[PDB]
Paper text:
The [name] ΔNC structure includes two domains: A canonical α/β-hydrolase fold domain and a cap-like domain. Compared with NDRG2, the helix α6 region of [name] is a flexible loop.
Among them, a truncated construct (residues 29–320, [name] ΔNC) with an N-terminal hexahistidine tag was successfully crystallized. The disordered region in the cap-like domain (from Trp173 to Leu182) is sequentially matched to the helix α6 region in NDRG2b. Interestingly, helix α8 of chain D, E, and F were structurally different from that of chain A. In the crystal packing of [name] ΔNC, helix α8 of chain D, E, and F were influenced by adjacent molecules while that of chain A, B, and C were away from adjacent molecules. Therefore, the crystal structure of chain A, B, and C of [name] ΔNC seems to represent the structure of [name] in solution than that of chain D, E, and F. In the crystal structure of [name] ΔNC, the crystal contains six molecules connected by disulfide bonds between Cys30–Cys30 in an ASU, whereas it was grown with monomer fractions in purification. To our surprise, the crystal structure contains two different dimeric interactions: Chain A/D and chain B/F in an ASU. However, the predicted solvation free energy of the dimeric interface between chain B and chain F was −11.5 kcal/mol, which is more stable than that of chain A and chain D (−4.8 kcal/mol). Taken all together, our results indicate that [name] ΔNC forms a dimer, wherein the chain B/F dimer represents dimeric interactions of [name] ΔNC.
Numbering used by the authors:
A (entry chain A), B (entry chain E): 29 to 172, 183 to 320
Write the structure that this text describes.
């Protein structure tokens, strides 16, 4: 039913978790997490939600852990060359060849969402569709205390983060303990050094300076209280509106998939129906 | 390549025109023209365009003429029971069944857009997606001189009607000469008899009091200078935004398939790419 693979890439080893069994024609739901998290802390609560098991049983599900972010991972040596964001994206095609995966439907949070975008631009033939949570298609442009507090700021809004409710302290413990703290630095370093996605919205008038844009279907997802609102909004204006949709989720900040899974599952179902998959869903 | 069929239905005879052959589990691009037009005056100028014949090589094209609206159609006898807009939609499964078709990608104009929309709600299993040009989901809301002058004003905006005579004059003659004038008044009457499409936008928490909507991918099209702007915007407001995109074509009159085929074809190509069809550039 399930399996775990330490897949050999040109940029090192990538740890994956396959759930279910895919047929040749149907794509796999490939998953890619955010900084401070892994496939478990990011997605398991969402994917194992009642309404999601109705959807996921029809598909296979391939959960990608970022280098040295998988649970029980050993510490990378001090001066280890940690894969760049673009290089992380180049580690995905080898995963698809190893597991004989013909194509994917991508779900990504933050850093994961960037990587799956780069992957989708790198290979439109492999990506059928994307669900991009808290995506930032822009470079940071900000380089300077506590890596855990830096990542908590990336995820949760100031109002939300200042309050320090059960959710905040829960995910403080996740980021602190679940992930190798030496490797988390390097993964955050890679993400903070991401380049501009170089996407621009096409104009039907004529070719737009050969600006690239996601060919596949794209569902953008952001919480109203999220610090990534302006980033996801900017990403929406730079993507093809005919193949892109913007979901603003109410009374919600960081990690919409964990806080409002019932709403995001319904959004996901509609998204999968539009593509022609899972018609009988009543 | 070419075959025209006079398909026998319960609501009478429907004229269809099949271009190319449909094979290998791919949908036919089924079309439905507007009031005062037929498939020739509505689509042949759009479909014979250089950038459209590149797409239609891989697809099969089924041109549906509305009862009596086809070329050289004999006049319906005085007091003929002309099918309702809901009955016109109930004639489409016979078409799909008669021609051994599994499903369609629908291109509807005005009344044709309403008819394809009703067909999609009745039979979501038979419709993979809809391009709806100048669609109005709401009933006229009231009842009634020169039929040609009415249909011109239906199609064409105020500043457009007197600015570009070349189009208005050519189509004045299409509405007047190329179609049976007895039958035309009946098709017009049927369209003005249309009920509310009874679609509502889904709430991501709420259950709409079990209101229905289009479960397929939909591209709403209308020109900035069309008299059908607010009706198509009103249609957009009542559809699922995750499955629906609105295209307001800048500097575009009543007929974007006639006026701006270059831009609309490009839009339709992106629309088909989102569904997973026609991956590579044409």
């Amino acid at each position: 039913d399930c399996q775990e693979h330490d897949i050999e890439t040109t940029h090192g080893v990538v740890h994956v978790t396959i759930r279910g069994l895919p047929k040749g024609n149907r794509p796999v739901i490939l998953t890619y997490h955010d900084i401070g998290l892994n496939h478990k802390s990011c997605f398991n609560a969402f994917f194992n939600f009642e309404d999601m098991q109705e959807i996921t049983q029809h598909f296979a599900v391939c959960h990608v852990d970022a280098p040295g972010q998988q649970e029980g991972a050993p510490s990378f040596p001090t001066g280890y060359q940690y894969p760049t964001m673009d290089e992380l994206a180049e580690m995905l095609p080898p995963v698809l060849t190893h597991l004989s995966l013909k194509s994917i439907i991508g779900i990504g949070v933050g850093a994961g969402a960037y990587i799956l975008s780069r992957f989708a631009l790198n290979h439109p033939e492999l990506v059928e569709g994307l669900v991009l949570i808290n995506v930032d298609p822009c470079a940071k442009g900000w380089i300077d205390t506590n890596v855990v507090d830096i990542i908590l700021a990336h995820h949760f809004g100031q109002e939300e983060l200042q309050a320090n409710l059960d959710l905040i302290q829960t995910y403080r413990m996740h980021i602190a303990q679940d992930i190798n703290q030496d490797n988390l630095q390097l993964f955050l370093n890679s993400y903070n050094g991401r380049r501009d996605l170089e996407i621009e919205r096409p104009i039907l008038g004529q070719n737009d300076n050969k600006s690239k844009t996601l060919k596949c279907s794209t569902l953008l997802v952001v919480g109203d209280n999220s610090p990534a609102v302006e980033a996801v909004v900017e990403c929406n204006s730079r993507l093809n509106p005919i193949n892109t949709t913007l979901l603003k989720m109410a009374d919600c900040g960081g990690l919409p998939q964990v806080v409002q899974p019932g709403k995001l599952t319904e959004a996901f179902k509609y998204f999968l129906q539009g593509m022609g998959y899972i018609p009988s869903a009543s």
